[PDB]
Design an enzyme around this catalytic site. Structure first.
Site, PDB file in Angstrom:
ATOM      1  CG  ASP A  95      -2.524  -0.931   0.814  1.00 33.87           C
ATOM      2  OD1 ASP A  95      -1.608  -1.876   0.159  1.00 33.87           O
ATOM      3  OD2 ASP A  95      -2.583  -1.190   1.803  1.00 33.87           O
ATOM      4  CG  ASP A  99       1.239  14.033   4.350  1.00 39.55           C
ATOM      5  OD1 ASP A  99      -0.152  15.186   4.978  1.00 39.55           O
ATOM      6  OD2 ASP A  99       1.660  14.863   5.440  1.00 39.55           O
ATOM      7  CG  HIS A 119      10.984   7.417  -4.375  1.00 33.79           C
ATOM      8  ND1 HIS A 119      12.303   7.614  -3.546  1.00 33.79           N
ATOM      9  CD2 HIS A 119      10.945   7.132  -2.731  1.00 33.79           C
ATOM     10  CE1 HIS A 119      12.398   7.662  -2.702  1.00 33.79           C
ATOM     11  NE2 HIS A 119      11.347   7.122  -1.779  1.00 33.79           N
ATOM     12  CD  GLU A 120       6.245   6.678  -0.919  1.00 33.09           C
ATOM     13  OE1 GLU A 120       6.590   5.638  -0.668  1.00 33.09           O
ATOM     14  OE2 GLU A 120       8.161   7.846  -0.646  1.00 33.09           O
ATOM     15  CG  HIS A 123       9.987   2.437  -0.763  1.00 33.13           C
ATOM     16  ND1 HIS A 123      11.102   2.122  -0.262  1.00 33.13           N
ATOM     17  CD2 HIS A 123       9.697   3.957  -0.406  1.00 33.13           C
ATOM     18  CE1 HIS A 123      11.653   3.619   0.034  1.00 33.13           C
ATOM     19  NE2 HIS A 123      11.035   4.404  -0.074  1.00 33.13           N
ATOM     20  CG  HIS A 129      15.495   4.974   1.206  1.00 36.45           C
ATOM     21  ND1 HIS A 129      15.450   5.560   2.346  1.00 36.45           N
ATOM     22  CD2 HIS A 129      14.285   5.511  -0.164  1.00 36.45           C
ATOM     23  CE1 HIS A 129      13.491   6.185   2.574  1.00 36.45           C
ATOM     24  NE2 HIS A 129      13.645   6.186   0.877  1.00 36.45           N
TER      25      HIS A 129
HETATM   26  C1  LIG Z   1      11.236  10.951  -1.533  1.00 35.00           C
HETATM   27  C2  LIG Z   1      11.516  11.171  -2.869  1.00 35.00           C
HETATM   28  C3  LIG Z   1      10.406  10.479  -3.437  1.00 35.00           C
HETATM   29  C4  LIG Z   1      10.510  10.705  -4.905  1.00 35.00           C
HETATM   30  C5  LIG Z   1      12.173  10.640  -5.256  1.00 35.00           C
HETATM   31  C6  LIG Z   1      12.641  10.234  -4.700  1.00 35.00           C
HETATM   32  C7  LIG Z   1      14.541  10.843  -5.168  1.00 35.00           C
HETATM   33  N1  LIG Z   1      14.990  11.190  -6.827  1.00 35.00           N
HETATM   34  C8  LIG Z   1      14.756  12.081  -7.350  1.00 35.00           C
HETATM   35  O1  LIG Z   1      14.377  13.478  -7.130  1.00 35.00           O
HETATM   36  C9  LIG Z   1      14.884  11.715  -8.855  1.00 35.00           C
HETATM   37  C10 LIG Z   1      14.166  12.791  -9.823  1.00 35.00           C
HETATM   38  C11 LIG Z   1      14.139  12.368 -10.620  1.00 35.00           C
HETATM   39  C12 LIG Z   1      13.803  13.611 -11.942  1.00 35.00           C
HETATM   40  O2  LIG Z   1      13.728  14.678 -11.565  1.00 35.00           O
HETATM   41  N2  LIG Z   1      13.169  13.007 -13.029  1.00 35.00           N
HETATM   42  C13 LIG Z   1      12.815  14.804 -13.988  1.00 35.00           C
HETATM   43  C14 LIG Z   1      12.265  14.189 -14.677  1.00 35.00           C
HETATM   44  C15 LIG Z   1      10.433  14.294 -13.355  1.00 35.00           C
HETATM   45  C16 LIG Z   1       9.324  13.580 -13.328  1.00 35.00           C
HETATM   46  C17 LIG Z   1       8.524  14.232 -15.012  1.00 35.00           C
HETATM   47  C18 LIG Z   1       9.426  14.411 -15.422  1.00 35.00           C
HETATM   48  C19 LIG Z   1       8.823  14.208 -17.507  1.00 35.00           C
HETATM   49  C20 LIG Z   1      11.374  14.688 -15.491  1.00 35.00           C
HETATM   50  N3  LIG Z   1      14.775  11.646 -11.163  1.00 35.00           N
HETATM   51  C21 LIG Z   1      15.208  10.515 -10.434  1.00 35.00           C
HETATM   52  N4  LIG Z   1      15.182  10.827  -9.241  1.00 35.00           N
HETATM   53  C22 LIG Z   1      12.309  10.868  -3.457  1.00 35.00           C
HETATM   54 CA   LIG Z   2       3.855  16.643   6.114  1.00 31.51          CA
HETATM   55 CA   LIG Z   3      -2.771  -4.224  -0.126  1.00 27.18          CA
HETATM   56 ZN   LIG Z   4      11.538   6.198   0.416  1.00 32.28          ZN
END
Ligand SMILES: Cc1cccc(CNC(=O)c2cc(C(=O)NCc3cccc(C)c3)ncn2)c1
Ligand SMILES: [Ca+2]
Ligand SMILES: [Ca+2]
Ligand SMILES: [Zn+2]
Ligand SMILES: [Zn+2]
Length: 169
Positions: A95, A99, A119-120, A123, A129
């Site tokens: 799941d 927030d 990212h989520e 997981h 990480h």
């Molecule tokens: C807690 C947490 C949540 C989310 C992510 C992270 C860490 N990773 C990054 O921050 C990250 C950012 C990007 C990036 O910026 N890519 C370019 C892009 C992004 C969106 C849409 C388009 C069209 C292009 N690529 C790889 N990693 C930590």
């Molecule tokens: Ca918060």
């Molecule tokens: Ca589930």
């Molecule tokens: Zn994370």
């Protein structure tokens, strides 16, 4: 007989997800598009398939909530924690919770929902990480500003160590 797998991962390639509720910040269409693209990030490099369910129990239940919302990881209002997901497993495993005291967007302002969701879901699929500052799974949100998203190699290697590459071309 059967012993538990070596690594925490889904034992089936066909996974389902359900968007339980929506944030006030974006239209339903924007949220659905963001999550669909986020799942495609992972299905594109593995044999995994993601099917959306509109109701019922899905493998990956997605929801927006605030403060105490049904688990041992309460959110904290604006700033601070932004989202979390449980590793593969029964019931709440997989799941993903966002927030809703944060600002979600489809642009570069606040937190880009697609990026955080990608990212989520990492997981939700079994990735923890990474120490690679440029990896999707790095612990700190680092929007690069690029116009195109490309899954970093560290993440590709990580997810394929669990599920294989699927069709390589
Ligand atoms: C807690 C947490 C949540 C989310 C992510 C992270 C860490 N990773 C990054 O921050 C990250 C950012 C990007 C990036 O910026 N890519 C370019 C892009 C992004 C969106 C849409 C388009 C069209 C292009 N690529 C790889 N990693 C930590
Ligand atoms: Ca918060
Ligand atoms: Ca589930
Ligand atoms: Zn994370
Ligand atoms: Zn939660």
């Amino acid at each position: 007989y059967n012993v538990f797998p070596r690594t925490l991962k889904w034992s089936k390639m066909n996974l389902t997800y359900r968007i339980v509720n929506y944030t006030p910040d974006m239209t339903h269409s924007e949220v659905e598009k963001a999550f669909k693209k986020a799942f495609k990030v992972w299905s594109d490099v593995t044999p995994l398939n993601f099917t959306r369910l509109h109701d019922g129990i899905a493998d990956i239940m997605i929801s927006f909530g605030i403060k105490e919302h049904g688990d041992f990881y309460p959110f904290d209002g604006p700033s601070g924690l932004l989202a979390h997901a449980f590793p593969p497993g029964p019931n709440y495993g997989g799941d993903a919770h966002f927030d809703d005291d944060e600002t979600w967007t489809s642009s570069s302002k606040g937190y880009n929902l697609f990026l955080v969701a990608a990212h989520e879901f990492g997981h939700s699929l079994g990735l923890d990480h990474s120490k690679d500052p440029g990896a999707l799974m790095f612990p700190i949100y680092t929007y690069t500003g690029k116009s195109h998203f490309m899954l970093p190699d560290d993440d590709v290697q990580g997810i394929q160590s669990l599920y294989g590459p699927g069709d390589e071309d």
